[PDB]
Every structure is written in C-alpha cells, then in structure tokens.
Symmetry: C3
Subunit: 477 residues, 3 copies
C-alpha cells in the first residue's frame, strides 16, 4: 500500500534508477493512444488523477483561479493541451518555465469521402497523407483505424464525440507490388493512385432505411460505418462526421542485443511530449502551490508537422492565452506580460537526430548525439532553431547542477535543417527559447528508434528544469 506508492513514484519519476519501467509505460502509451485525439485524452485523464482542474477556454477564468493559484489545464480542439501550476507567491518578475512540444505525428487520414468502388472485388479506402507518409516505409505495414467520430443521439440535438480504435485489428494494408513484375514495382509510388490501403475482399447485408438517414451514408462504405459505429456504441444513423487516422498497430518494443534500444511508431514528437508531461506530474507531486512562487507549464501543440499555422498549432497562441488569462484571474490587477515573458525560459522540446552510423556523411563531427546519454541541444545559426549562447549556457549549467549530460546537434554546412516551433514561440512571446530534445533514429519513419534509457533520462532532465531553471537563470542577471 504505502510501499507500492513509494515504488510507483520511483518507477515513473526514476528515483531508484529504474529506466526500464518508464520505457514500457511509454510503449504502452504509444500503443494505446494511436491518434492525436487519444494522446491529448490520455494526458487529460493523467492530469485529472494528479489533481489538475480542467478549465474551459469558452468561459472566463476569473471565478476558477484565485489568490492561492493551483494546478490547472485546458484543451483546444481536442488536440492542443496546456497544463500549468501557478504559485500563490508568483509575481510577473518570476516569469514562466515552459516546455513546448507537439502531439501530432506523421499519419494517413481518411478522405472526407473515403468511398471507393470495388476493384475486381477488393475493398479500398480513399486516404490522404498527413506530412510525408504514403512512401515505401508505409508499404506492407499492419494498419489500424482510429480517431474521432461526431454523433447525434436519436431524439436529441446534441452533437457529441467518441474516440475509436481498431487495435489490435489491422483493418487495412498498402500492398507493395512484387519485384517479379519489373519496372512497375520500382519506387517511388504515386500517393493518389498507387499507395491506396486495401481494406477487404467481401463476399455475398444491404443498407437499411435507418442507416440511409445517416449524413455519412454514401460518403463511406457501409461496412466501415457499421464497424466504427459498433466500436463507438452508436447507430449508423447517428453518425454526423469523422476524422480517422490509419496507423501502424505494431506495438513498440525494447530491442538490440543488449536491450539498448526502444523501437516504436510516432516518436516525433510524442517522445518529448510524454517525457515533459511525466516530468511535470512528478515535479507537481512535491509542489505546494500555497508556498510556491513559480509559474510552470507544459503546452502540447497540434499541426507542427504542417508548419504550425492553425489555431491548435504553436502559432495559434494557446501558451500566451493561458499565461494572460491565468495571471489576470490570479492577481485581478494589471499584469505586465512583457515583464513576464522577458523573465521566462521556454524549452522547445522536439526530437532531433541520433547519429546514424550508416550515413556518417550527413552528421557534423562533434555535433551529433548518441543513445542513452541525455538531452540534446538543437543548435543552428540560420534561425531553424531558437537556441542562443545564453540558452546553451543555461542548459549546460542546469545539467551540471542536476547531474545530467547534454549533447549537441547541428547540421553540416553543406546539409539542410528541419524547423521546430521554437522560433515561433520566441517571436510570439519575446522570451528566451531553447530548442532541445531526445534524439532518435529514423525520424518520420512509420517505426522509429531511440535509446531504451532515453525516456527516463528525458524525464529526469525536464524534472530538473522545473525544479531549478529559475535559480539557474538568476545567475545570468
């Protein structure tokens, strides 16, 4: 009972040097929450279990947050979440300790009309890529279906939503052509005409009159509508709309001959999102908000893989909104947000690239990370990352204090860089922003890899950030 509670804290927050348990919780998390909707829902439920109070965006917060502050979260669009801890003794000059990550991952979306005519008896579905999917890595993979259904119960005018998930059933697969056929079997393949998921081969019930009353009748195969309705526990007639993903249902696993690796889908950026959220929860356990003088948050964004210019992406400003609304409700007096942000540190936590020993020519000597060491700073002099000399120094100081190791990633001068939310958050807030993350192999694959210790090592680092960033940043004044 009491020993199990101590052992639980030790596993989740790596207090007894137990990295294996947190690695498995991450794997289970990825497997049980295939879509962005599931991930945000998982964290929402996690936050409820650790006494964070949900606040709706749709209502003013002046009545919900008082002088004692506390632990809160809000959700936008079901895909964009911000959790935060506000201290009774917080002032504008203390700033905010932020970790910003994204919860969207490369996937395949069902088209608004997924219906395709049968092709020599084969059932197929019309889909679209979200980011750079539907390539050769997506061929011959077991694909489940899941996401958000919108429904309206009979004899009501309420539109409600349900999350669905076929796991472990792979409902479809994108079949490669056998190499025996020659040149037609050689990639790359047309994302509209060639990489189409095969969902069935049915044999010889037709649609009922009630099923035909569904808004989605004609838009999707009657078998599909029946299936998702059964998963949701509603009638076909009640289905209003849907937003469904196809995703790899292969469960993650520890691997390598010495178990040094973790293989799993959708690491970018659910890896950092998970580690940052668990760190927040671990940190929150020992925070009395009545005595604290800090403002801490993890904010999770959608649509980072498509450039962040949506209301649920980093450019939509959920962070800025949360800090403005909370501080207004907290003090009930004029808060200078420019002073707030000038004293803040934002960690833009996004996965970066582990050294791949089979492609040494793309990695910059002395500026790549390796597995199971620690967090990696993303450095770039051309604005792809927001990291600057003070932020580098802050993180290195933090790590030396907390016993963490820090690695570097920067591109070769003849190479090219990805871009993160970091520059966007820095510009929108005016606050010093540091791009960093847990490094991984095979980013944007359907199944990626990181170190087996790296989930725990990330949790450890981010926990130390929340504990010590304010004290460390004060050295620079």
């Amino acid at each position: 009972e009491e020993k199990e509670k101590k052992e639980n804290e030790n596993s989740w927050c790596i207090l007894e040097h137990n990295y294996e348990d947190i690695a498995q919780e991450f794997i289970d998390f990825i497997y049980k929450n295939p879509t962005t909707y599931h991930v945000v829902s998982f964290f929402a439920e996690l936050l409820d279990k650790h006494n964070f109070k949900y606040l709706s965006e749709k209502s003013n917060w002046q009545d919900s947050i008082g002088e004692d502050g506390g632990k809160f979260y809000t959700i936008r669009n079901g895909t964009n979440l911000s959790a935060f801890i506000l201290g009774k003794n917080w002032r504008a000059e203390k700033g905010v300790g932020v970790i910003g990550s994204h919860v969207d991952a490369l996937t395949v979306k069902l088209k608004p009309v997924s219906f395709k005519d049968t092709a020599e008896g084969y059932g197929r579905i019309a889909v679209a890529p979200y980011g750079g999917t539907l390539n050769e890595l997506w061929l011959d993979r077991d694909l489940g279906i899941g996401g958000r259904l919108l429904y309206k119960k009979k004899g009501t005018n309420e539109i409600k939503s349900a999350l669905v998930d076929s796991t472990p059933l792979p409902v479809c697969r994108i079949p490669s052509l056998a190499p025996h056929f020659g040149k037609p079997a050689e990639g790359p393949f047309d994302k509209e005409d060639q990489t189409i998921p095969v969902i069935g081969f049915p044999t010889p019930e037709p649609p009922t009159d009630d099923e035909k009353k569904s808004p989605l009748f004609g838009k999707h195969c009657i078998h599909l509508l029946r299936y998702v309705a059964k998963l949701a526990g509603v009638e076909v007639s009640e289905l209003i709309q849907m937003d469904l993903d196809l995703f790899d249902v292969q469960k993650g696993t520890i691997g390598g001959i010495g178990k040094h690796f973790l293989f799993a889908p959708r690491l970018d950026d659910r890896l950092c999102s998970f580690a940052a959220m668990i760190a927040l929860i671990c940190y929150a356990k020992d925070v009395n908000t009545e005595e604290s003088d800090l403002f801490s948050t993890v904010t999770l964004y959608d649509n980072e893989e498509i450039g962040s210019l949506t209301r649920q992406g980093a450019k939509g400003g959920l962070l800025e909104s949360v800090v403005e609304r909370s501080s207004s409700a907290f003090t009930k007096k004029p808060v200078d947000l420019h002073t707030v942000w000038a004293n803040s540190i934002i960690l833009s936590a996004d996965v970066n690239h582990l050294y791949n020993p089979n492609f040494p020519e793309v990695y910059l000597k002395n500026h790549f990370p390796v597995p199971n060491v620690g967090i990696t700073l993303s450095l770039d002099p051309n604005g792809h990352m927001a990291t600057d000399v003070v932020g580098t120094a802050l993180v290195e100081e933090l790590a030396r204090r907390n016993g963490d190791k820090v690695q570097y990633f920067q591109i070769k001068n003849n190479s090219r860089s990805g871009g993160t939310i970091g520059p966007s958050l820095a510009s929108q807030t005016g606050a010093r922003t540091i791009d960093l993350g847990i490094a991984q192999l095979s980013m944007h694959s359907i199944r990626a890899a990181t170190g087996s210790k790296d989930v725990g090592l990330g949790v450890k680092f981010f926990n130390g950030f929340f504990k010590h960033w304010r004290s460390v940043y004060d050295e620079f004044g």
Copy 2:
C-alpha cells in the same frame, strides 16, 4: 410594393436568381479596381444605415451600450462591416465572414514612361500576381484606380478614383504566328508583354504642367487624360496607383444560360455574396434586441500572401472586435473567451470541376455549377477547415435548406492557400474554409454558375441567422 420587389431580387426571397446575377455583373464592370470595390461597399453600407468609423480616432465616444451597425476602412482597400447587438456578451462570440477584394491585375510602374518605339506609345507596368501571360494578350484593357492630388494654392493631399471604362486605353499585342518561333510563348513579362497605349501624330508640355511632381514620370498624354477624368489640373497630380484591367462586361452564357462569364471573380464573387448577405440579414436585425456580433471583413493583398497592414495578417478583424467591445462595455473584455466561442468563415473561391482536365480533380471531392457553397478541405494546413467546422456547415445547410459540396486536391496534386489558417491562428477561433466554386481561376475572364451568386447569398444569410444556434449543438 417596390421595397418588397427589391428585397426579393437582392435577397432571393421570391426565388429570383437572374437579378442578383445581373447586379454582380454590373458591380464587377462598374468597379474594376480594389479601391472601387471598397468604395462600392462603403456607399452600399451608407444606404443601409451603417455608420462609418475612422481608424484614426478612438471609438469610445462613437459606440455605446446600444451597439449598432458600423464599418471601417484601412488604406482604402481593407473594409470591415459589423453589427453589434445591445445584448451581446463575450460568450456569444463573433460570426465572421472573411474574404478578399484584391484580384490579379496589372499595375502601372511608379514611372510608367517609355520612349516612343517607332511611333508607338507604350506604358511600363508590373504584374500583380500571375498576370501578363497568354490570357492577358489581345484583351481590351481599361485604366483606373487612385490619383492623389493637391489643389493649387492649398497644402492638403486628397484622393480621387478614375476609370476609363468603356474606353480600352491599351492592349498587349500577341505576335502573329506567321513569324514562327518568336511567336511561341511563354513571353517575357518585362520585354514582351508591354501594353501599347497609342500611336500619336503631330501639344507639348505647358509651364504649369511641368510644375507637376508626376511630370517626367508619366507620359503627358496619360497625365492629361487621368487629370481630365478626375476633374483636376495636371500640375495638381502628386501620385497615382493605377491598374489595367479587362473592360469586357460580364454576361450570362451557356446554351441554357447556366453560366456567368466575368473578370476578377477571385475573390469579388464571395466578397459580394457575403456583403449582400450581411445587408439582407441586417434589414431584419434590431440591434436593440440582438445578442450577436456579426461581421464581413474584406482584405487586400491575399493574392500576394496577406503580409501587409491591409491584408489578413494586418489584423483589421481583431482590431474591430477589440475596439468595438471595449467601447461597448466600457470595461475589461476577455477577448480569448470571445474568440473561443466564434466561427470564422474564410470565404474564398475554389475550383469547379473542369471536364477537360479530369486528371487533376479528386473523385467525390469536386463541386459542380448551380448546386451550392463548396467546403475547401485539406489535411496539410492549406485550409483551416476541420471535422467540427465541416459538421457545423453541413448541419447549418440541412437547417436552412442549402446544398454543400466538397473540394480537396488529389494526393499527387498541388494546393493553394487562403487567409483561413492566418485568421484561425491570429484569433484562436474555429475557422472554416469554403466558397463559391469557379472555372478558370486567375484567368483574365473566369466563369461560375449563373445561380451561384444567389445560392452563395442564401447560404451566407443562413449563416448569420443560425450559426450561433447550430454551434450550440456542439457544446
């Protein structure tokens, strides 16, 4: 009787789609530049009892507890009209239609002067967006836009709009195919697609005309002409912002009159439909009794990416809502709560199925003429439309008796972007990309359905009436 007949034609109350189609054609023809379009809507708003508010003055003394019907203009090319009900509160949100009034055109260069070329007069021009291609060759081009002038013996700089219509002052002449390879396009936009304005025979500049700041920057024939159109002296002209545009008047067409052919549909088609819908809706709205905040905001510079003060990224919508709500309550307004409860229709024209290019249209995701409004859907952020917005629009249409169509690109194709994503992130409000579909977007002369203007007006009117009620189903 006359007022009942006008309401039927303009607001499609008696099922009359012909008249509103003709008014749209007349509107496009009579207002060739963005300046003219904004001026048209300003005059229209004045006639329906909307009060102009200047951006340069604080609105607290102009808007009170009763709210009302208002509009404002930035740069002469960015206009926001709004209806603020006396019983509005932050949790009601705002119902917004955002469209753009800029269209592909050709601009006179700051110095339009060119030396005569074997006797031919020509003017130096620049493309605004993807113009000066083969579709702009051999078209009758009028000249028009904004002149800035200063009356002689005064210091004030004033504005006049000018328009040569029906006179086409110039034409970009194709080379006869007889000459062979030189006559094959594409053509150089600087050296080959140059408007020919005249061929003058053997008065030189007077001493007064030389006092013009524009003397030497434009041909004296041109300066005299635009001076005459504005009713000012050449000496008084300080600057100008002039377009060249197709003066071919729009028309109903097709063997069964199913089509409307007209220039500059992108996006004056949705802008007109949304604005007429707002005026129709406003006729039956008592602002003393209303609990809603409704707006149509019209932007400039969308075709060049919206990053100007008069484009979507310049934030006129957000400013209007902030200034209105501060003046209205005279107390702190939670603008985050306002936008969280809002719906933005990003109304921009999308693509009708072209039966001659079936390979670029996505099966089950193309619109056809004369059916209804088309949702623009995109999973990679080119459009702001999401699952809830789709369901909302479909719910709204089922209630109002409208039809809804889909547009989405093929996976192996390419998509343009709209202001929708910009508005969504700037406000944090759910934004829905949709519009009236058309053929031949970005041509000098495009086409849509002859009923689509009226169908568009009907849908947007339905939006203003029922969006709040329908969106409450999702809460």
Copy 3:
C-alpha cells in the same frame, strides 16, 4: 560645440567627417554585439536612460516622458523619445533597421584535429557567406564570451575583438591544379578557416584550464587567446558566440573620392544614419514641450528571416510603445488608434545601379550614388511601400530639400524582402520601405557613395522633424 554638431549632423555641409565616423564605427564594431554596445554608449552620452526589459516600466517612465532605450539579447535595441504632450492620435514616428550582417560563426565546438600541422576552426555561415568573396580575406575574430569568475555564481558577459590581428584566412586553391580550383566550393569541407601552423615550442593544458566547460570544445590556444582579450582565466570561460569578419578598415575611394568602401553595409549603413539622425534630432527636443513619440528600433536576424525574439517578428517595437504608453498615462491607451496614426520607415539598404550589369536594373527605377535616399517599391508584397507612403516621402523631401530615388525590380527579375511587411502587418501602421543604396550587397566588402551617409542622416533628421506635420496634409 558648433564644430562637433556641424560634423555629426551635417549643418555646415560637412559630409566627409560623418563618412569617416561611419568607417571608424564599422571598423571598431565588427559584430552585432559591438554595434548594439556602440549605440548604447552613444545614447548614454546623449542622456537617454537605459530601461531593462525584465522590470516593469511604471517606475521608470512617468507623465513627463523622456529619452529612453532598451536592449534584448544584446543584439536588438530600441531607442525612443516620448513627449509629455503625446497622445494616441499623434501616433509614432518610427525608423526600423537591422544590425545583423552576413558573417561566419564559430561552431559550438570549433575544435578540429591538426591537418598535416595546420590549425583550422570549424565554422558555419550566417546568411550567404563562405563563397568566393570570402576567400583570401584577412579574418579577425570577435564577439561575446560568457564567463563566471572563480568563487562566484555570476555568469557575466565580455566582448572581445582581435582587430587588427587577422587570426584566420580561408585559402583559395591555386589555379595551377586545374578543375579542383574552380568554384563553387563546399561550405563544410573546402571553405574552412586556417588559424595557424603551431611548432613544438602552445604549452600543454594545465589542471585549472581543464576545469573550463569549454575545454575540449575549442583548442587550448584559441581559449587562451580569447581569455587574454577579455581579461579572465580559461577555467572561468562558460560559453561563446564568436564571428569571423573582414578586418580591412573601410576607406574613401574613387579617383574623385566619390565612393566609400567598407564591410557589412547591409544594414549597419542605415542603422548608423538613422541613429545619428535620432541623436541630432534629440539635441533640440525638450520632452516637457514635445507632443511626439519617435523611435529608432534596431533588429537582429533580418538576414535569416526575422523570426526570432530579437528579430522584427519578435515585436520589440510593439512592446516598447505598449509599455511606454501604459506607464505614461495610467488611463488606458488605444494602441489601434496609436498605430493607425503612425508612420514606419523600414530603412534597409537597396541596390545602386551597377553599370556592369545593366540587364538586371529597371529603367527609371534605379538609384545612383551621392543623390539621396532611395524608396524601395514592389507591387507583390516584398516591400510595404504604398502610393500614400511614396507621396509622403516625396512631400517630406521637397519640404526638407532632400532628393528621392526609386528602386523596383524588372518584371523578369527577383526581389529580396525586408522587415517592412512584417512591421506593417504586426502594427497595422502605414510602412514605407526605403534606404541608402549600395553596390555589391552581401559581399564581404561593399560600396556606397561617400556623401550618402550624410545625405541619409539629413533625410532621417528631416523625417523626425516634419513627418507629423506632412502626414497631417493627407488627413
């Protein structure tokens, strides 16, 4: 006193002194850090009070207004003068420029193994550097060191500069070797700075030196060198952000001394000219009497797209005006009214006519040396300049006795973009892109007219004196 004012502020037609001060400024302040520090020291000497971003400005700015400046990141500076009689309807008179220039940055780990005895350092390009123009140039090293004195927990900053010593040179391969000596060259493997060729008798690292966080990240000779320049121990070094730059001092040139040759003109030329205009202007402003709000805001990261906290998109201008106006009045300020009445000059260098490349310059739309400020015009959103802005600057010039030139690209050419569109969009204010024209933009060593620095200062000084009065004629 009068001789100093006449030299700096060009009051007795002395253009050579200010040109030489500019050359000295460029030579003594090679990095963005030095440039901001130079302007900070200049502002201090002219009685502008420094305000930290990290504290509320309520206790530093009162109803009297005054002369102030603030700094973000050591590279983003905003200086401003706020009049006691200022109100929202007077707006703000803004010059916005950038102080970052194309350079070469040391990598976070600059260490390289010796290569047949040669010492080299690992570096990266900031903008389009490490090309053939960067070969065979004498390169100095300088920038910001972070250190922590022994027995303290205080991270402090020091600026270092090797000038006149060129520590580095990127050596071209001799043409004798043939094809390998033909560019372009790989920026990672071929354009690597050579820093030395050490001999055995450069001592081994001491135990204290090994305690540095930077031990292993840079070779010990480099660490010892930068420690000696800052006056600290190697062990105390925490981090560094260092540039490589041309140490060739600028000069007046041409057979008639019509030119000025110097490195890093983009955009320290306009920044210097704008800042000196502000100080010259500020000498005769009594803030107790003034009703104006004036600012020069200097940005970092313009050359890489401005999307950082210290770039234009980070909003230091907007922040300055909001914080100032809040502390100034303590009765709420309508910022939308403020910006609606404002003028922003986006002052960034544009392109002088290069007579060797006539084919890329647009006839009647290029500037020449020693005439005056050049308006940057573009109808596709690369610049923010509009017809009213053009007329304002021309009016202003006519009143102050300045000359104005034009720059616009040919229809078949390509344009760069400035911060102008960003600033116009973020504020909603009318923004005018203009600048002092130069040859050879983005070279390691560029050129402008020898009179153009003074002509720039004179024009910008005229702007601060007269912009409010002139813009009132357009109302």
